[PDB]
Symmetry: C2
Subunit: 144 residues, 2 copies
């Protein structure tokens, strides 16, 4: 079960891609409507603190629990309820984001995190599988 | 905030087991003779003996903060932890694996399941526990 606690081990997961289940492209087709929208999202993605994900342990209700926190651009996920199983490689994030997003990449990032169902990863990489309607997409992350 | 520093990549090493406001390292009557105390102090010099660790673990599909400890021959593995940073309370529940013959090891294991409150900083941790009608303290250090 050390594979699960390596996800919490003093690291911030930075978004690197949002694509289809077995796609080689960085972003799935139709995420943006034009080049200017994509360009503006890519500039927001270059900012260090934007599109981050953190697995932390916190003292909630007189007991320490593992939760998920994330920051897109203007919206935050703070101490979302986490279910994670190292044997079955399943994951579930429950709660609601604080703040609203105008950027399409930020909207996809926040919605996708609450729809995660399974994952895979190592020390430096994390892949989260999420359902987007009838499809299955993946959010890729990196940790320095 | 202060609570998660107790879990921050550190092992707590036992330094003393004494009375609530006592200056002595070990309370009077812990051992019956000089040879018993000497033998316990040699077991206490071993790095891996009388250690305490606050860790996060995936227990039944969810990550929880737990307590682990090693005395000499006995272990406490992922004991259920209740801890409150505001009121500085603490509770450790479960049972140790293995039996102890050493009196310091018996006191260490029993005392950990009877903790009720604490205080500490980056390098020091003090756990208050009830021993019958009395209140004793276990002191720890982290390098």
């Amino acid at each position: 079960e050390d594979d699960v606690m390596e996800i919490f081990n003093d690291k911030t997961w930075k978004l690197s891609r949002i694509t289809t289940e077995k796609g080689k492209e960085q972003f799935y087709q139709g995420l943006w409507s034009n080049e200017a929208e994509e360009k503006a999202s890519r500039e927001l993605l270059k900012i260090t603190e934007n599109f981050t994900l953190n697995f932390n342990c916190a003292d909630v209700n007189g007991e320490v629990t593992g939760t998920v926190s994330a920051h897109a651009v203007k919206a935050n996920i703070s101490d979302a309820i986490l279910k994670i199983d190292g044997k079955e490689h399943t994951i579930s994030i429950s709660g609601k984001a604080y703040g609203s997003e105008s950027d399409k990449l930020a909207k996809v990032f926040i919605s996708g995190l609450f729809n995660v169902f399974k994952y895979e990863g190592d020390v430096h990489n994390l892949t989260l599988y999420f359902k987007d309607g009838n499809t299955t997409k993946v959010m890729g992350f990196t940790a320095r």
